RNA sequence: GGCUGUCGUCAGCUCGUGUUGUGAAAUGUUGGGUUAAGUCCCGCAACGAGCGCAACCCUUAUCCUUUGUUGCCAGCGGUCC
RNA sequence: AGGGCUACACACGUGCUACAAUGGCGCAUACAAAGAGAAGCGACCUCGCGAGAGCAAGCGGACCUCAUAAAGUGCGUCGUAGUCCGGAUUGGAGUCUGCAACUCGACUCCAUGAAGUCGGAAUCGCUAGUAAUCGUGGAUCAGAAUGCCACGGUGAAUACGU
RNA sequence: CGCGGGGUGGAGCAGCCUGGUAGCUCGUCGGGCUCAUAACCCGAAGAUCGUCGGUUCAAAUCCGGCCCCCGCAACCA
RNA sequence: GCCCGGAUAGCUCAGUCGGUAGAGCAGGGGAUUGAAAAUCCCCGUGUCCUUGGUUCGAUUCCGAGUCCGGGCAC
RNA sequence: UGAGCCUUGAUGUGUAGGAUAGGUGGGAGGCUUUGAAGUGUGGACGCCAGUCUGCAUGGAGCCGACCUUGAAAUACCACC
């Protein structure tokens, strides 16, 4: 007779609020949830969400990474979020939009992107 | 190319029913100019379908088209380097035409005895979600689902917009600037 | 950015281009190239050219008035 | 020589005269808008014009008019209908 | 005068007819335009399986004749089997035009009856009375038309967008 | 001297272990795209397995002889 | 000659506590591009090795033997 | 913090079934300061609403026993 409801085995840790980091780049976007005190609570990515090819660097693929990730942290009973945004890729703002539409409350959309003060020499790519 | 947008010649309503959509259906069934032949093959098919099940004659016909209607279709705008298709909403008129066309394509290659049995089965199967043109709608929906949108000249669309004083915004779209 | 100091709830009108300190549109000049050390003499010293484009517009109003362009 | 195919029914191609350039040459024939069109309007050191586009031409689409057989038959008469 | 261009190992362009059931076969039945015709077209008549025959009216072109419009409509029939599909081939008999149809004609009929199950790479024509498809006439022409030239029947997909 | 390996469609290679089986990449020829060649695409053709014999129902294959190509060996005082 | 441990889609593995035949890649067709490289799609196949046995039924759960792979033997 | 040995407590969601089917014998029921039950509050909880149940409250029956369905039937004590 029985045909199932519960999505996973019973919740673990349980921290109520967390930080997310979206590393968006030209080839792929990675969304990683953490604790305030620095601990990965789970991740998912565009490439791991089954896109590959040119689809891997698209706002639509970025969204579907975020919703997949949102499932992985349900085991932690999280409700509130802050989000760090990181890099020049597409999906950069579109990933956030998927997190608020996941039912999460987002505290700050802090773009962090790491900028040399002139610093180390870039590669010279696309050459003539 | 093409200066002027105009089209659509106007069809005469069906003689038995007074209906426009059946009269369009008999055209897309029509080989080699024979309208009076296509008429009979359609009516004998339609009556086979409505006797099989349908309190109204056009009941089971209308739901036949409803299950094979394709919501979105895959178009190519040529980025090059292997394009990969772009979904577009299929306009309701072009929705009807794709849907009617596919049932008849399937009927024409059934190979059973007479187009009236071939057609009646292919409507019968697609009314009840197991036909040859159910499958082709489902296959088109699979290719449309996988290729959920992406598009090109994104950089050029924003700068061609800036050259006409057009806003700081861009999004995936077809055959034209974004 | 969407901006983190606007007031903290998600309000989705904010246009990220109309909300950028600097990010993207110059800031990542430093990636997938080194702008070869005085490549800027031909990349960036086209300042005269864009100052000319402003001069040209400021001229073109006046010539249209005396010629009666409409 | 005649003639014809083709680029192409693409819509362009150029003369006089005036002017600017040492000169080949440009100008007009470029600009603004519009069209099937160098089409038409506006506006200028270019002003005028010719070939070309359009037009006339035939044909078809109505309707009037006149004709009225070897065509026609609504009424009409006769009727083998 | 006879031979030749009309050969054949093969390769290619153009078109026809087909591979079928929206059909082929049979019988009954419907409504066109446009043209040609006194070197010609030729009814009615009786004869021939038929192509054709002879006998003979008529026509100068809205009149007579080529000329039975075909697909379509009706009804029956066949059952996915290279077949009641396809008819290429070849035998045999036969007709006509003309001096003569062997090389090098067209057509009738009996018989027979191939490849062909929608075609690799490639690829072309079209925007609406169009394409597709069905028949009809004509120029040349004693005799050879799938071609070319024209006429009318039935009559579509779709064109968002550049 | 001697010993062991080799002799395949026009080229280079595979299959060679008591066996019946011909494959790959080039080149070739026909068709296609292109103004035309190149390339690119599709189709096809091409070896009676060096040569002679023997064993075998059957041999490129196993066995024997000869010619041809290669590797090693042909010393010791 | 023992103890081990494996024997399935063509392959490796595996949904397979007995009530219940799959993931990854392989070949065909469709859908697109300077055919392709490359997306996306729908089929891919097994009496789980041959025999015993528990049982309400069980391949696997308990067992005997063939072949592969790993030890100690001699 | 692994493991063994071992002390007490426990889950087994098939097909049909009200639900409860770890293998299997006993067995017609167990009544300290009751054994109630039952609605309610939380916890564990997984082939999802299906078991056990701290405990507020209640001192006013679980439930088999041929009560029924099913190869096996349940309560309740052993066995592992």
UniProtKB/Swiss-Prot annotation, chain A:
Domain of life of the organism in this record?
Bacteria
MF GO annotations = small ribosomal subunit rRNA binding; structural constituent of ribosome
Keywords attached to this Swiss-Prot or TrEMBL record, sorted alphabetically, are:
Methylation, Ribonucleoprotein, Ribosomal protein, RNA-binding, rRNA-binding
Q: Cellular component per GO?
A: cytoplasm; cytosol; cytosolic small ribosomal subunit
Q: Look up keyword Mitochondrion and say if it applies.
A: no
Which residue ranges traverse the bilayer?
A: none
Q: Which residues carry this modification: N-methylalanine?
A: 1
Single GO biological process annotation from the record: translation
**Cysteines joined through disulfide linkages:** none
**Which Gene3D superfamilies does the record associate with it?**
Ribosomal protein S11 (3.30.420.80)
Q: Which InterPro entries match?
A: Ribosomal_uS11 (IPR001971), Ribosomal_uS11_bac-type (IPR019981), Ribosomal_uS11_CS (IPR018102), Ribosomal_uS11_sf (IPR036967)
- Assembly and interaction partners: Part of the 30S ribosomal subunit. Interacts with proteins uS7 and bS18. Cross-links to IF-3. In stalled ribosomes contacts ribosome rescue factor SmrB.
The text of the family note is: Belongs to the universal ribosomal protein uS11 family.
Give the protein's function: Located on the platform of the 30S subunit, it bridges several disparate RNA helices of the 16S rRNA. Forms part of the Shine-Dalgarno cleft in the 70S ribosome.
* Additional notes on this entry: Has been predicted to contact the N-terminal domain of IF-3 based on footprint studies; exactly how IF-3 interacts with the 30S subunit is controversial.
NCBIfam families xref list: PRK05309.1, uS11_bact
Q: What is this protein called?
A: Small ribosomal subunit protein uS11
Q: Which gene encodes it?
A: rpsK
Swiss-Prot record, chain B:
Coiled coil where? Answer: none
Keyword set includes Transport: no
Pfam family example for this protein? Answer: Ribosomal_S7
One of the record's GO cellular component terms: membrane
The Gene Ontology biological process annotation of the record reads: cytoplasmic translation; negative regulation of translation; ribosomal small subunit assembly; translation
SUPFAM superfamilies from the UniProt entry: Ribosomal protein S7
What residue ranges are annotated as transmembrane? none
Domain of life, source organism = Bacteria
Any one GO molecular-function label of the UniProt entry: rRNA binding
Recorded consequence of changing residue 115 to G: Significantly decreases affinity for its own mRNA
Among InterPro entries, the record links this protein to: Ribosomal_uS7, Ribosomal_uS7_bac/org-type, Ribosomal_uS7_CS, Ribosomal_uS7_dom, Ribosomal_uS7_dom_sf
Additional note from the record = The strain K12 sequence is shown. Has been predicted to contact the N-terminal domain of IF-3 based on footprint studies; exactly how IF-3 interacts with the 30S subunit is controversial.
Family the entry assigns = Belongs to the universal ribosomal protein uS7 family.
PANTHER family documented for this protein? RIBOSOMAL PROTEIN S7 (PTHR11205)
Purpose = One of the primary rRNA binding proteins, it binds directly to 16S rRNA where it nucleates assembly of the head domain of the 30S subunit. Is located at the subunit interface close to the decoding center, where it has been shown to contact mRNA. Has been shown to contact tRNA in both the P and E sites; it probably blocks exit of the E site tRNA.
Subunit details: Part of the 30S ribosomal subunit. Contacts proteins S9 and S11. Cross-links to IF3 and the P and E site tRNAs.
Q: What is this protein called?
A: Small ribosomal subunit protein uS7
- Where does this protein come from, organism-wise? Escherichia coli (strain K12)
UniProtKB/Swiss-Prot annotation, chain C:
Compositional bias of kind Basic and acidic residues:
59-70
Q: Which residues form a coiled coil?
A: none
InterPro entries, per the entry: Ribosomal_bS21, Ribosomal_bS21_CS, Ribosomal_bS21_sf
Q: Which GO terms describe its cellular component?
A: cytoplasm; cytosol; cytosolic small ribosomal subunit
Q: Which domain of life is it from?
A: Bacteria
What residue spans carry the Basic residues bias annotation? 45-58
In this chain, the stretch annotated as Disordered covers 42-70
| Record function comment | Probbly involved in recognition of ribosome rescue factor SmrB in stalled/collided disomes; fusion of protein fragments to its N-terminus decreases ribosome rescue in the presence of SmrB.
Summarize the subunit comment: Part of the 30S ribosomal subunit. In stalled ribosomes contacts ribosome rescue factor SmrB.
Belongs to which family? Belongs to the bacterial ribosomal protein bS21 family.
What this protein is called in its record is: Small ribosomal subunit protein bS21
Native source organism of the sequence? Escherichia coli (strain K12)
Lineage of the species this protein comes from = Bacteria, Pseudomonadati, Pseudomonadota, Gammaproteobacteria, Enterobacterales
Name the gene behind this protein: rpsU
């Amino acid at each position: 007779a029985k045909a199932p409801i519960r999505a996973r085995k019973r919740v673990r840790k349980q921290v109520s609020d967390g930080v997310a980091h979206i590393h968006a780049s030209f080839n792929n976007t990675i969304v990683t949830i953490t604790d305030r005190q620095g601990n990965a609570l789970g991740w998912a990515t565009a490439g791991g969400s089954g896109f590959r090819g040119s689809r891997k660097s698209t706002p639509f693929a970025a969204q579907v990474a975020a919703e997949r990730c949102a499932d992985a942290v349900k085991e932690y009973g999280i409700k509130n979020l802050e989000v760090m945004v990181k890099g020049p890729g597409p999906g950069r703002e579109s990933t956030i939009r998927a997190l608020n539409a996941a039912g999460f409350r987002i505290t700050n959309i802090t773009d962090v992107t790491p900028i040399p003060h002139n610093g180390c020499r870039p590669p010279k790519k696309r050459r003539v | 190319p093409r200066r002027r947008v105009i089209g659509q010649r106007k069809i005469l309503p069906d003689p038995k029913f007074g209906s426009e959509l059946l009269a369009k259906f008999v055209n897309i069934l029509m080989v080699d100019g024979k309208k009076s032949t296509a008429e009979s093959i359609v009516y004998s098919a339609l009556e086979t379908l409505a006797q099989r099940s349908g309190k109204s004659e056009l009941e089971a016909f209308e739901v036949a088209l409803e299950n094979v209607r394709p919501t979105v279709e895959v178009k190519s705008r040529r980025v090059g380097g292997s394009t990969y298709q772009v979904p577009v909403e299929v306009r309701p008129v072009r929705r009807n035409a794709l849907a009617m066309r596919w049932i008849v394509e399937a009927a024409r290659k059934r190979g059973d005895k007479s187009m009236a049995l071939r057609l009646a089965n292919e409507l019968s199967d697609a009314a009840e979600n197991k036909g040859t043109a159910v499958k082709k709608r489902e296959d088109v929906h699979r290719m449309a689902e996988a290729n959920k949108a992406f598009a090109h000249y994104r950089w050029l669309s924003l700068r061609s917009f800036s050259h006409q004083a057009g806003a700081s915004s861009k999004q995936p779209a077809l055959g034209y600037l974004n | 950015p969407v901006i983190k100091v606007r007031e903290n709830e998600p309000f989705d009108v904010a246009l990220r281009r109309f909300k950028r300190s600097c990010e993207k549109a110059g800031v990542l000049a430093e990636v997938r190239r080194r702008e070869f050390y005085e490549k800027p003499t031909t990349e960036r010293k086209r300042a005269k050219a864009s100052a000319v484009k402003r001069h040209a517009k400021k001229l073109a109003r006046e010539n249209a008035r005396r010629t009666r362009l409409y």
